[PDB]
Amino acid sequence: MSYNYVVTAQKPTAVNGCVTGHFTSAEDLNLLIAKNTRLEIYVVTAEGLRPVKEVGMYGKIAVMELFRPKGESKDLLFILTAKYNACILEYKQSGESIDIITRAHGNVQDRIGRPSETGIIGIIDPECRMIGLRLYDGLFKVIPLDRDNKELKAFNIRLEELHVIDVKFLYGCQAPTICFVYQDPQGRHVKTYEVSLREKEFNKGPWKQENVEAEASMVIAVPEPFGGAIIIGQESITYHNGDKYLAIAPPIIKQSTIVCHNRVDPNGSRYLLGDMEGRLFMLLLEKEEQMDGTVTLKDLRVELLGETSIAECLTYLDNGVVFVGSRLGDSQLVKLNVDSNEQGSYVVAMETFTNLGPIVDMCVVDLERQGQGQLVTCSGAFKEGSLRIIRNGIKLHIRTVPLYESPRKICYQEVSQCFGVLSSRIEVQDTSGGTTALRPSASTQALSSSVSSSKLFSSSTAPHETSFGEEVEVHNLLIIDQHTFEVLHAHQFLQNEYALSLVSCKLGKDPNTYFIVGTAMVYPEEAEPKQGRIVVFQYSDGKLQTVAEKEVKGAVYSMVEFNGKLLASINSTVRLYEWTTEKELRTECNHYNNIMALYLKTKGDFILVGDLMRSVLLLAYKPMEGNFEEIARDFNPNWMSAVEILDDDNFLGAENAFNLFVCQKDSAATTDEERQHLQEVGLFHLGEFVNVFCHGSLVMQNLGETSTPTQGSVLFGTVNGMIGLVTSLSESWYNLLLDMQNRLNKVIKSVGKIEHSFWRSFHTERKTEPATGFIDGDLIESFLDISRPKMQEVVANLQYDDGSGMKREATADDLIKVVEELTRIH
Amino acid sequence: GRTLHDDDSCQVIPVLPQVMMILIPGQTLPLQLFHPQEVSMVRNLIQKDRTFAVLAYSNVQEREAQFGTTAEIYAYREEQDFGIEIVKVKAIGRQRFKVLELRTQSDGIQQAKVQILPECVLPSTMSAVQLESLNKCQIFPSKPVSREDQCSYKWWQKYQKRKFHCANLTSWPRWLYSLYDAETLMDRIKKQLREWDENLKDDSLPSNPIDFSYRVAACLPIDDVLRIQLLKIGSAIQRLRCELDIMNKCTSLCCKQCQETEITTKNEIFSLSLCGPMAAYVNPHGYVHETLTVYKACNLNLIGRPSTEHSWFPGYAWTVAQCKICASHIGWKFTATKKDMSPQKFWGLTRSALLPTIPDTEDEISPDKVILCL
Amino acid sequence: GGRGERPFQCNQCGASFTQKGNLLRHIKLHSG
Numbered sequence A: 001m002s003y004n005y006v007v008t009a010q011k012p013t014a015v016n017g018c019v020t021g022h023f024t025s026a027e028d029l030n031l032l033i034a035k036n037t038r039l040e041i042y043v044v045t046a047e048g049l050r051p052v053k054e055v056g057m058y059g060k061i062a063v064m065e066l067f068r069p070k071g072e073s074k075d076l077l078f079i080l081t082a083k084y085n086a087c088i089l090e091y092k093q094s095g096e097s098i099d100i101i102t103r104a105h106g107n108v109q110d111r112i113g114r115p116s117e118t119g120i121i122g123i124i125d126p127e128c129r130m131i132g133l134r135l136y137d138g139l140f141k142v143i144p145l146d147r148d149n150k151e152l153k154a155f156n157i158r159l160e161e162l163h164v165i166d167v168k169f170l171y172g173c174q175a176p177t178i179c180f181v182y183q184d185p186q187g188r189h190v191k192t193y194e195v196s197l198r199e200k201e202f203n204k205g206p207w208k209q210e211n212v213e214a215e216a217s218m219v220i221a222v223p224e225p226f227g228g229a230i231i232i233g234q235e236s237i238t239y240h241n242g243d244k245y246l247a248i249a250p251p252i253i254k255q256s257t258i259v260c261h262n263r264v265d266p267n268g269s270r271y272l273l274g275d276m277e278g279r280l281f282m283l284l285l286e287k288e289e290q291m292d293g294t295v296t297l298k299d300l301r302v303e304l305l306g307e308t309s310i311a312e313c314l315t316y317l318d319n320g321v322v323f324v325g326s327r328l329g330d331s332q333l334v335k336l337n338v339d340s341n342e343q344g345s346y347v348v349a350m351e352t353f354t355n356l357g358p359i360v361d362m363c364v365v366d367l368e369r370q371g372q373g374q375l376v377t378c379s380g381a382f383k384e385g386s387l388r389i390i391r392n393g394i395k396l397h398i399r400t401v402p403l404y405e406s407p408r409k410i411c412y413q414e415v416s417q418c419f420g421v422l423s424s425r426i427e428v429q430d431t432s433g434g435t436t437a438l439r440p441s442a443s444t445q446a447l448s449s450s451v452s453s454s455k456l457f458s459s460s461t462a463p464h465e466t467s468f469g470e471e472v473e474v475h476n477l478l479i480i481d482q483h484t485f486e487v488l489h490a491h492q493f494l495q496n497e498y499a500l501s502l503v504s505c506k507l508g509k510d511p512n513t514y515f516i517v518g519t520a521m522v523y524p525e526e527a528e529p530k531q532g533r534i535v536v537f538q539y540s541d542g543k544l545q546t547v548a549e550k551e552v553k554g555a556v557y558s559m560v561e562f563n564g565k566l567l568a569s570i571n572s573t574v575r576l577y578e579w580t581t582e583k584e585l586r587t588e589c590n591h592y593n594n595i596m597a598l599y600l601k602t603k604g605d606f607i608l609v610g611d612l613m614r615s616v617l618l619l620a621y622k623p624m625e626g627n628f629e630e631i632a633r634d635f636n637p638n639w640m641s642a643v644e645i646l647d648d649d650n651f652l653g654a655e656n657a658f659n660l661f662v663c664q665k666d667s668a669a670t671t672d673e674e675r676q677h678l679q680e681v682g683l684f685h686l687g688e689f690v691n692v693f694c695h696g697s698l699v700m701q702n703l704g705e706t707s708t709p710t711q712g713s714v715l716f717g718t719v720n721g722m723i724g725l726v727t728s729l730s731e732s733w734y735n736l737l738l739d740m741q742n743r744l745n746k747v748i749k750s751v752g753k754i755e756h757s758f759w760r761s762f763h764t765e766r767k768t769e770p771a772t773g774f775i776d777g778d779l780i781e782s783f784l785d786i787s788r789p790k791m792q793e794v795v796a797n798l799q800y801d802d803g804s805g806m807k808r809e810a811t812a813d814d815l816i817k818v819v820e821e822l823t824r825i826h
Numbered sequence B: 001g002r003t004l005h006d007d008d009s010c011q012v013i014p015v016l017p018q019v020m021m022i023l024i025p026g027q028t029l030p031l032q033l034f035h036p037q038e039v040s041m042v043r044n045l046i047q048k049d050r051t052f053a054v055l056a057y058s059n060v061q062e063r064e065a066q067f068g069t070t071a072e073i074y075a076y077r078e079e080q081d082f083g084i085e086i087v088k089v090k091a092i093g094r095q096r097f098k099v100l101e102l103r104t105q106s107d108g109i110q111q112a113k114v115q116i117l118p119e120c121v122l123p124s125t126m127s128a129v130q131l132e133s134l135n136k137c138q139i140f141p142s143k144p145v146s147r148e149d150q151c152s153y154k155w156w157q158k159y160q161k162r163k164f165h166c167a168n169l170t171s172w173p174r175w176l177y178s179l180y181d182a183e184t185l186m187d188r189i190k191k192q193l194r195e196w197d198e199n200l201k202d203d204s205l206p207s208n209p210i211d212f213s214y215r216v217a218a219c220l221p222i223d224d225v226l227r228i229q230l231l232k233i234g235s236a237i238q239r240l241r242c243e244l245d246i247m248n249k250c251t252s253l254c255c256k257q258c259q260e261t262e263i264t265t266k267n268e269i270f271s272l273s274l275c276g277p278m279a280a281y282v283n284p285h286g287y288v289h290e291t292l293t294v295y296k297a298c299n300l301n302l303i304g305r306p307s308t309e310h311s312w313f314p315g316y317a318w319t320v321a322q323c324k325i326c327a328s329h330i331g332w333k334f335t336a337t338k339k340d341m342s343p344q345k346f347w348g349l350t351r352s353a354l355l356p357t358i359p360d361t362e363d364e365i366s367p368d369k370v371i372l373c374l
Numbered sequence C: 001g002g003r004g005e006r007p008f009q010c011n012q013c014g015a016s017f018t019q020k021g022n023l024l025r026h027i028k029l030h031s032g
């Protein structure tokens, strides 16, 4: 019933994995990067990185590890997707035609099985005898590495330890041995098991259960000379090997958790460790020959090299160069100098690869062309937080504005030629009583500055005290220039005040354009917020002044400009305020809902409301009555991340396991019961987590109306930096394109032989249905990149209609013209 | 053992005509059967699946029901009581259902075509957005299980900070995700249940949120028509959030014995002395009364004349007050002796006689229905 | 009636009664 088209405007930029090895040829060194559904292959040169091949998979890359089996020229690549599609890929080049051929594949999902708390863990034995996968608690799946195993037939092994944290395959063992840290009611422990492929079961490990630290989170197998393994926790780093057990508690690692590692020297003498706050350390393992040549670990040392981007993964390339794979910020290439610099750091940045990072909010603005729109996003988190202005070339051109603090919400104000941005910075509790900042950020380095006057809650405050060292986030409304992007003004909110919503509009008869902010007073003892405000600000003469302030009984989660009035949402209530002649908000309506009004979107007199559990609700303001009325709803429990009104009857949303869905106002409805239900009319597994939906387009709006094939345009921002676009089609165009997708799938070569139908099928841990009411634009647009006989095969015995009449045999040149028209929407 | 049907499956099961009260999955249903058709029907069920339907009536007079619960028989015994031969049976609530058809047989017993409503179980709200690097930090190093240490909000602060760290990648804060967290929601209920009445928490309530949510839905002091709302909810998260809303909406107090009489509202509570609104006072015979002071109270009858003998609030005379319906003792009406006294007339209610409840709107002038939140 | 002054009193709540029988009934209600 809904006919939609979805396409990628910007591919996912956030790096979730990186591995080095010899994938292309045994001689040259490669770096493989996993950017969610994309896989980039580079060659490591003395200058930097040389791009060799980039491929797209029909699946979110969960595991990615290289390995060289016995009797193979170069390394093979094992990949596992989020939907459990396992595959062994090989790099094959013929003259100037590069192709990633699928040596073996198969789905490794188990119908019945509770997925693990620590997610998917995929490891390979150092001698390539097997691939060990930990997908579900209580079971260890084993895919034996035999030349006969092409479908990836595997068997599960009963594991008595339910809560396994991390697991690795040990080096220098007679039989394949796994080492893992797990938790039980007596705390955390490290245990080993020998994996028998003949018996298809576990055997006694070389060194049975050993007690580890309370927060033991990482396991690292050490190569042949040393042997054994390194277990990293919060306060300590310990090395275990048979009888010996050395443990060190260096104070330099206590301030933050080590969340990623990488081997530097192939013997295991050096390792790179990265914490949550961007620090980079060097873990060194001192050796001891011991006459006979057994070689034992003498000592462990940790050295702080310096600061990088918040690293998700790390990988030592060569000659002091390390690739810093980041999710919250830009990924990098950094040089590790033997001697430090004047500041004391041993790290020096070489390249900075742009990452649109977690796009938490965004907006579309014209800015300078006065016709062509540009997209301004709230990107990254913490020191990696920034703004990004994405625009078309007229390829996408990106301009970065670093903030050094977390940006949260963004809106534009044309009247004052500037942007309003809600943002938060982390400060630490000082001995003196007050708080101290970590680094100088956008809110601390503002030209004009101000603090909110405590009136409402200065008197009405709960009794409590904050202890030394505790972190506290400081919220600010930043006024940023549209041209220079300098922080013109920074307004700090009250103590314990969390700023949630932000709008820029004209209310009532008032000709001034105000920046309205919705907040919530967040105390730790108080679970659900019972206090908040709506602050009306006016930016003029380089200063921000508080026009009005309205106290509320809850958290102002969302606000929208509603026909010259302010529509706000306080917890379960959806309230309508009117802007009086005395310049104050006055309540006109209230609507008490069965859900928490988190998501608030509007179209004319219609109001779309939604909560975190995908409870969708459609209200309507009755003007003659002067109150709200519920039109329809659809409550199916599932996690919802964003929502939007496509047209008067259709509503788009983003629900659990990276899916997109469309709800529709039931037509041909006789009964009130059926009129009051929104029918699910479209489902599609996007493979990205949407945070913001935004009406607009990044292409020339087109002055003269020349029969557009697509109607409407909704852009969207995701956690991986991917930007997509959604649009509506006609029944004829949909049925054509749908038939086209199924023809395209027969001729297109999928990496890992994963089915497109299976990939885009709506999926959750409980239910998995096929995709409906959605045309895969990435698949349709790939038609222009294919070869003329494959186009001839796709258009073979296919009927194309150009409108009104002439329903003739479709040709590749007619279809090329149609797909070329679709590529112009982004 | 245990007989369980498939999710969203269509089944036809019998309905015992004597039954009427709502049965929540997990809670037990004791039955006393006298009529041979009821006994014979139950004896057949023992040989078959041992399961029958318990309809959740909207109106028991007209026998109107849209949902219900399958009841599995786990105990049968042919007893004798008061010179009457009666069979006693115990059943336990299992699956929830939506009523499709209610065909009535030749006997008083009726069959019921029903669709099994599934138990919605969702993963952690952060499961999707969690960083691979931070997956290993998601696990906690055991519970503090020291009443004082977990009642202290410093542990729940550490829990929130760790579990919902990746809320920074999303458009919402950590504290919002806690409002849809099973463990946090259970703890909030436990704390408010202890606030209502002092009791042993470890023994009385289960650790599982599915089991916990049902246990609470059965024990809440509410109307069975309101209870249907909890039966309709399929997600234990939504079920717990709804229970906390119901709990927060119990702003009135009623006769614990009959529960048909709204005595007073929390708004009428007031502090006469600096001790507090509620305080324990002993009478001249050693009976201790935890007494709540309220400005106004109603649905009470006064017994005898006022007396100043051993008054707990000097300057006032007590008059014994009892429930208009069941005559159970609710407390006393304190009436001032002098004209210069501040409240002049107030009420001292005994805590043990009262029970929390949602303010009823029996008047047909403005009956605004209770709108529960998920 | 019985005794106008209400000499029969309840030790639990102070409820006075005109006849002993009424007090006995009253004290049975405290048991529940």
Ligand SMILES: Nc1cccc2c1C(=O)N([C@H]1CCC(=O)NC1=O)C2=O
Binding pocket: B282, B283, B284, B285, B309, B310, B311, B312, B313, B318, B332, C009, C010, C011, C012, C013, C014, C015
């Ligand atoms: N004189 C008697 C005799 C028997 C029982 C009671 C009293 C009496 O005064 N109270 C309460 C009534 C309420 C009060 O204010 N103070 C009391 O001690 C009793 O329960």
Ligand SMILES: [Zn+2]
Binding pocket: B255, B256, B257, B258, B259, B260, B261, B323, B324, B325, B326, B327, B328
């Ligand atoms: Zn009563």
Ligand SMILES: [Zn+2]
Binding pocket: B329, C010, C011, C012, C013, C014, C015, C026, C027, C030
């Ligand atoms: Zn008494």
